[PDB]
Enzyme design. Structure first.
Site, PDB file in Angstrom:
ATOM      1  N   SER A 214       0.819  -1.207   0.000  1.00  0.00           N
ATOM      2  CA  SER A 214       0.000   0.000   0.000  1.00  0.00           C
ATOM      3  C   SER A 214       0.855   1.259   0.000  1.00  0.00           C
ATOM      4  CB  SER A 214      -0.936  -0.011   1.205  1.00  0.00           C
ATOM      5  OG  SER A 214      -1.660   1.200   1.287  1.00  0.00           O
TER       6      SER A 214
ATOM      7  N   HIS B 130      -5.167  -5.730  -1.501  1.00  0.00           N
ATOM      8  CA  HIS B 130      -5.324  -4.541  -2.331  1.00  0.00           C
ATOM      9  C   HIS B 130      -5.604  -4.896  -3.784  1.00  0.00           C
ATOM     10  CE1 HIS B 130      -4.470  -1.052   0.235  1.00  0.00           C
ATOM     11  NE2 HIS B 130      -3.719  -1.875   0.942  1.00  0.00           N
TER      12      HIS B 130
ATOM     13  N   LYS C  16     -11.401  -3.555   1.007  1.00  0.00           N
ATOM     14  CA  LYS C  16     -10.899  -2.587   0.045  1.00  0.00           C
ATOM     15  C   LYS C  16     -11.829  -2.438  -1.154  1.00  0.00           C
ATOM     16  CE  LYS C  16      -7.176  -2.502   2.624  1.00  0.00           C
ATOM     17  NZ  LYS C  16      -7.156  -3.837   3.271  1.00  0.00           N
TER      18      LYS C  16
END
Ligand SMILES: CCCCCCCC/C=C\CCCCCCCC(=O)O[C@@H](COC(=O)CCCCCCCCCCCCCCC)COP(=O)([O-])OCC[N+](C)(C)C
Ligand SMILES: CCCCCCCC/C=C\CCCCCCCC(=O)O[C@@H](COC(=O)CCCCCCCCCCCCCCC)COP(=O)([O-])OCC[N+](C)(C)C
Lengths: 492, 464, 492
Positions: free
Chosen positions: A267, A295, A327
């Site tokens: 990230s 992610h 997410k």
């Protein structure tokens, strides 16, 4: 390892003058923090902190003061950037409640004013499923009405439910693996499933930029932990070879197992793991792979199947595929996918399977609806549109930011843009200037990142349009000119 | 800078010595390549005992298959000679290295019996400690005179002769250019010494020239090392594995061109080649002094146990004090030495037996030519040559089995043949399986023709 | 390890002044050797040595001169002690051809006269089987007349005979093991059968005083060789423990095998191996035992069965039993005894089995006749009196020598008796004065031994009568008075 498509990533080095000025600023902050501690000690200046009650004054002090040094002196001065309360759906535009402090961030009082129409770059939606109204919300409302919010038991006991089985089979079909299991928290997923796989006498090769959940899960198990450099396949090869040929550290017995913990997209860095090299090394040295796709499960891939689709690898190569629904799909949760033997062993021996409450029914319903929308079971052209729009937005935003003269990290496909500020004061300055212009961003400082590298991270989305990106780019250009953030040598 | 020097000279001595030791400390730190963790872990006694109890050793001898051909030994019910008795079947001997037929010569037996009555069977000690008899000195002098060399030394075992002669002169760091198809004795001799072994193709002076030139280049790289490095060329006069002679004149010229001494092995050619049977040197006419060391054994032609090495005193006198098989082992029994001396006398008396052996080898080599399934490997002058498989199967076991089947069929037909045996794992260059044929002055022409016909028919029947 | 009989041995340490005088002598010899080398270097003194031929002066020198230092300067001065030709059967009395040198031992020439009736203390005929007139010689002559002298082929080929099979059966019955094999050289036995048993990746624990054949056999194989102190059971146990625990040096893996090489009686030292301790440790640590019985196969034991009979152990405990017929049985040869699988594997995979000629036919007949005589199959009381006579001779000689004030090494039951001289000049002096008094002995100097320990070894026999022993003892006492060789503190 062969790359079907080109693999590009740029990590520009810090200009030396900026490094020297960074150290000057940190030294000034350290000296003034020491002076403030001295003043607070001799009661010359009133201290705005709580103290242990009178009946417990004789007890040993609960905390060590020196541990809170960076909290009192650096964090507290710019505390207003973080913990901003929002009072609307975290879409492309979010409403932030205004708060003000008259004692230098020690206490906040909520002004009645409510900022509206703030461009949202901190929220983690990648396909824009965090919508107030839609088909997903209607299905979730129906399931909430007939089931109720929250289940009051454990999966092994009566707490198991049919919706959970439906979600597990849907996830298994989505990933392409034989079976999968669902948990009520991704942090819980890692921390509660890593100890089951490995124990004392095994080795865990952890990346240098791993999430806190993976590190905690590795620490809870008794396995030895070795850390290799971030995306340096030479270092991974070196540690693997040494581990195989040298055996256990004290008594040179062979290792029972070798487990490699890697992530899809990191990230903060923004980089994408070199999956083909890792798979090749796994096959050559006979290790096991634990791939965290929190992610990249929705952001990456032509259809959004994760990193394994993006690179084109076979999903059966990776031993364990962790993942998170928070997410991309817009609902809290987690999952692990793999072969049926692994999933049966987990259902039998898993901490959250036995001791913790399962998922809430409305959440699993909304996840099912979103995943069916992505797969294409609804019949609407949606799902593919979101992926195309996200890819276009990522490419456009990264190109415009790089051509302006800024420093950007990470791969060119990742929808996470970590701009660099490099200085402690510029962190608070950039946060406040962005908020003043109706853009919300996320800034990160020293105790987290290496000292020289301080960043501000933008999380792109498919909810953002070209007008919103144009406005954000214009404001970012104005502020970057104001704070002289254009450190890029090649373009400026 | 002059003012700095003047100020330093005006400084006290203790200050300067302290600064010097500080500079030495700086150098030590800058050259502290090793990085230490201060982490020390010692095994617990319980863990040590667990490791002791856990370990299980491999068996001393691996389990052997019952199908190994070498496990079955041929039992000879009598002396190994012409018209022997192998496995209870009467046969003509075509398998034992007795070229001159001196095993059953009555003069040899009479001399051995006389020396047995005079001295006994055992010597009971090394050559240093009361193990030297006058017969040993007589035999050494006889060998020296016969070979036209200054000195000779005798060992009590043929393998030990060369396996202990080679390591004595070659040490670590030297270069040895040894033929590829050299017997196991030379291979073990070269393994005992730690020198660097360079292998060249069988009877290819092109490869020898190439290797010598490469070594010359490496010498040009470093003259100081090349000053203290010695080079040897170890060859065999008449090869055991192949049955082909060696080209001495080219070897001698390469010696004098590239400064590398020559060690010759003459186990097979000692008593069969040349007009007077002095080896390959007489056959080629090359001078005896060109070759440094010439080794042989007294077992094949002379029909007695032992071996010897001959040459000038400069090279020979070293083996008396550096040869392992000589310094640390009992001496040759007197009766064997007397038999060797009598055999030497017989050889020196009438030198036409070498011509007889030559003509019989020619006859058998000519007759054998024409087998469909077997090819003759060797030369017309060789007394022992090989019959190899013309068309080789995939695996060695089937080749050995076919050859053994042919050998057994021949044995039932009154011809005694043996197959060449090797250590499969140890041999550097492992020769193909072959049937060994040996020619003796005892065998007449008619027996040679009959043996040729027998092996021919048996090969035709078995291979078809 | 339990000793059913007392185990007495005495290795008295050297007097201090004697050590100082030894070093004085060696220093003088070294300095004068350097002087002689310098004189010969400039051709000031003519050298009586052979030189390389004129055609080869360009070649690199064959020998390094410094290696021959002790050959030219020390060995040449007393060379007349060694290499003494004889012209008779090496019985109790041997006839030595006499030689004289006028070039200070560089060249020798033979005088006509021969010395007759020299008492023989250098030969190895422990049981006195070296007789030119006896039943064994009749059998050897009978076999020599028929079989001929020498066989002209290898065992695996036609060179195998019936005599060799008969000898192998006889040896197997003699030792008490299942099977045995016979070779044509005692040196070749070790050198060509040790590499077959143990290869690379194994450990060969070798004693400190092993013969050169055992060391060469170990060196030819690629195994790792470690050396423990002479009859120091603590050192053997420590090496066994460390080898098992720490594994291989470069890569800590368990050893494939551990082999322990020991001898029955050490020739020069005179000691007998501590067999019960070695067997106990071998059983405890699961190692294998190689027992070289060249000296103890005829000399030791109530019936001359070996050293295992002397200690009362079981022959099945020792894995490999090597032996030599040269010492006791009076004929040259060697053998290895053990279990049937060992013998089959050696018959298949031994260097001398495949590449070297088998034994001579008359020699195997002499071995058979002598071994039958020792067994008692002949039925005559001869062959059992020989062991008693050898034991009595050893007891008498050792006790009388010890009570004169000499220093003697080794056990009380070992026929080999080392007598210590301690000085370089006393080596040559003792040898020459003993020959002058008609006794033949073997003197051993520095490079063979430790520097302080230069000795003279007596090999007793059952052929020695009491009158011969008394004459030898009287002459030894007179020479000891002459040279002052009584260095014993306890007795004189
Ligand atoms: C740990 C102590 C480390 C002291 C380092 C001080 C470095 C800072 C310094 O010198 O100047 C500081 C004083 O600094 C102080 O006055 C420090 C006083 C610390 C008192 C803490 C009391 C805890 C009990 C003030 O620096 P300035 O002039 O504001 O710039
Ligand atoms: C390196 C060489 C080491 C030589 C050390 C010399 C020690 C011997 C010495 O000093 O005296 C020797 C000379 O000795 C010589 O003069 C010989 C000189 C070297 C000769 C090398 C051949 C002679 O010593 P001395 O008086 O005969 O007793």
């Amino acid at each position: 390892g062969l790359y079907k498509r080109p693999f590009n990533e740029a990590f520009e080095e810090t200009p030396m003058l900026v490094a020297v000025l960074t150290y000057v600023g940190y030294g000034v902050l350290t000296l003034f923090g020491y002076l403030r501690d001295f003043l607070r000690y001799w009661r010359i200046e009133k201290c705005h902190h709580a103290t242990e009650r009178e009946e417990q004054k004789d007890f040993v002090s609960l905390y060590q003061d020196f541990e809170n040094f960076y909290t009192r002196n650096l964090y507290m001065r710019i505390r207003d950037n973080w913990n901003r309360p929002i009072c609307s759906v975290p879409g492309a535009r979010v409403d932030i409640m205004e708060r003000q402090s008259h004692d230098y961030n020690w206490s906040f009082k909520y002004t009645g004013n409510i900022i509206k129409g703030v461009i949202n770059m901190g929220s983690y939606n990648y396909l824009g499923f965090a919508r107030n109204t839609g088909s997903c919300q209607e299905a979730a409302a129906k399931v909430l009405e007939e089931y109720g919010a929250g289940v009051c038991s454990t999966r092994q006991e009566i707490g198991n439910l049919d919706k959970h089985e439906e979600l597990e089979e849907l996830v298994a079909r989505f990933l392409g693996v034989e079976a999968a299991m669902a948990y009520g928290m991704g942090f819980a997923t890692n921390s509660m499933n890593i100890p089951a796989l490995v124990g004392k006498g095994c080795l865990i090769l952890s990346d240098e930029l791993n999430h806190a959940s993976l590190v905690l899960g590795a620490r809870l198990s008794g396995a030895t932990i070795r850390i290799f450099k971030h995306n340096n396949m030479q270092s991974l090869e070196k540690l693997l070879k040494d581990a195989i040929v040298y055996g256990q550290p004290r008594t040179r017995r062979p290792w029972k197992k070798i487990l490699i913990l890697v992530e899809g997209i990191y990230s903060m860095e923004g980089s994408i793991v070199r999956l083909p090299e890792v798979i090749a090394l796994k096959k050559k040295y006979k290790a096991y792979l634990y791939l965290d796709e929190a992610h990249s499960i929705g952001a990456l891939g032509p259809t959004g199947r994760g990193v394994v689709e993006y690179f084109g690898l076979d999903p059966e190569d990776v031993d364990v595929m962790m993942g998170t629904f928070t997410k991309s799909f817009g609902a809290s949760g987690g999952y692990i996918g793999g072969k049926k033997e692994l999933i049966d062993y987990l259902r039998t021996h898993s901490h959250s399977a036995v001791y913790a409450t399962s998922l809430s029914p409305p959440v699993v319903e909304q996840i099912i609806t979103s995943m069916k929308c992505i797969m294409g079971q609804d019949g609407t052209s949606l799902g593919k549109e979101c992926v195309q729009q996200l890819a276009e937005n990522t490419r456009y935003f990264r190109r415009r930011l790089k051509e302006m003269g800024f420093i950007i990290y990470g791969n060119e496909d990742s929808p996470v843009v970590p701009l660099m500020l490099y200085m402690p004061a510029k962190i608070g300055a950039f946060g406040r200037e962005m908020l003043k212009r109706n853009i919300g961003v996320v800034v990160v400082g020293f105790p987290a990142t290496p000292i020289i590298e301080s960043r501000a991270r933008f999380c792109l989305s498919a909810a953002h349009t070209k007008e919103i990106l144009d406005t954000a780019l214009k404001e970012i250009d104005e502020v970057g000119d104001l704070l002289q953030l254009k450190y890029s040598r090649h373009r400026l | 800078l002059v003012e700095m020097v003047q100020a330093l000279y005006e400084a006290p001595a203790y200050h300067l010595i302290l600064e010097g030791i500080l500079i030495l400390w700086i150098i030590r730190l800058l050259f502290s390549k090793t990085y230490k963790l201060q982490e020390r872990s010692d095994l617990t006694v319980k863990e040590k005992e667990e490791l002791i109890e856990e370990w299980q050793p491999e068996p001393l001898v691996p389990p052997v298959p019952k199908d190994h051909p070498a496990l079955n030994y041929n039992i000879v019910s009598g002396p190994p000679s012409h018209k022997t008795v192998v496995n209870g079947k009467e046969c003509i001997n075509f398998a034992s290295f007795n070229f001159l037929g001196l095993l059953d010569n009555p003069r040899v037996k009479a001399a051995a019996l006389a020396s047995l009555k005079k001295y006994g069977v055992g010597t009971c000690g090394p050559r240093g400690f009361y193990g030297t008899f006058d017969v040993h000195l007589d035999l050494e002098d006889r060998l020296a005179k016969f070979m036209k060399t200054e000195e000779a030394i005798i060992y009590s075992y043929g393998f030990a002769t060369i396996a202990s002669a080679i390591p004595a002169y070659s040490k670590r760091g030297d270069i040895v250019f040894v033929d590829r198809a050299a017997c196991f004795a030379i291979q073990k001799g070269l393994q005992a010494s730690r020198s660097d072994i360079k292998l060249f193709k069988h009877n290819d002076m092109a490869d020898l020239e190439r290797l010598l030139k490469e070594q010359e280049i490496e010498d040009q790289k470093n003259p100081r090392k090349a000053r203290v490095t010695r080079r040897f060329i170890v060859v065999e006069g008449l090869y055991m594995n192949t049955g082909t002679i060696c080209p001495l004149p080219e070897l001698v010229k390469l010696k004098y061109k590239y400064k590398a001494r020559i060690f010759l092995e003459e186990s097979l050619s000692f008593g069969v080649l040349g007009e007077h049977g002095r080896g390959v040197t007489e056959h080629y006419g090359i001078n005896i002094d060109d070759i440094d060391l010439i080794s042989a054994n007294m077992e094949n032609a002379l029909a007695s146990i032992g071996g010897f090495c001959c040459g000038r005193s400069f090279v020979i006198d070293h083996q008396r004090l550096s040869g392992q098989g000589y310094c640390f082992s009992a001496s040759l029994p007197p009766l064997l030495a007397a038999a060797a001396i009598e055999a030497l006398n017989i050889m020196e008396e009438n030198p036409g037996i070498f011509a007889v052996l030559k003509e019989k080898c020619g006859q058998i080599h000519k007759a054998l030519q024409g087998i469909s399934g077997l090819k003759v490997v060797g030369e017309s002058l060789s007394p022992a040559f090989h019959l190899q498989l013309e068309e080789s199967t995939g695996s060695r076991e089937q080749d050995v089995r076919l050859l053994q089947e042919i050998v057994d069929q021949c044995m039932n037909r009154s011809i005694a043949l043996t197959q060449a045996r090797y250590l499969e794992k140890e041999e550097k260059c492992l020769p193909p399986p072959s049937i060994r044929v040996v020619v003796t002055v005892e065998q007449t022409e008619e027996e040679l023709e009959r043996a040729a016909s027998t092996i021919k028919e048996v090969a035709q029947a078995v291979l078809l």
